[PDB]
Amino acid sequence: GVSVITPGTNTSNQVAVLYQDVNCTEVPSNV
Amino acid sequence: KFNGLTVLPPLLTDEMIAQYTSALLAGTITSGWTFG
Ligand SMILES: *[C@@H]1O[C@H](CO)[C@@H](O)[C@H](O)[C@H]1NC(C)=O
Numbered sequence A: 001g002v003s004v005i006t007p008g009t010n011t012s013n014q015v016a017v018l019y020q021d022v023n024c025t026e027v028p029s030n031v
Numbered sequence B: 001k002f003n004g005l006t007v008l009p010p011l012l013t014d015e016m017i018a019q020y021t022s023a024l025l026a027g028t029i030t031s032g033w034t035f036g
């Protein structure tokens, strides 16, 4: 699954992304 | 693990919950009912 973490569009438009229980070496800065 | 089925982890780990119970237990051994 893929989840999007946002502070709210009334604060910012930046976003972070969680790839759930996926090893972070096979996803396709801060990893 | 499976087909479209996943298990999400709880927000509090087991370490955090054991920390909470040791804080309750040290509060009661040492202050009685005053800390609540
Ligand atoms: C939402 O926007 C309004 C006006 O743009 C502002 O007054 C309010 O503080 C904002 N809320 C947050 C949580 O930033």
Ligand SMILES: *[C@@H]1O[C@H](CO)[C@@H](O)[C@H](O)[C@H]1NC(C)=O
Binding pocket: A023, A024, A025
């Ligand atoms: C992801 O794969 C690498 C390569 O084998 C491994 O070293 C790493 O431990 C894996 N991730 C986790 C969370 O174990």
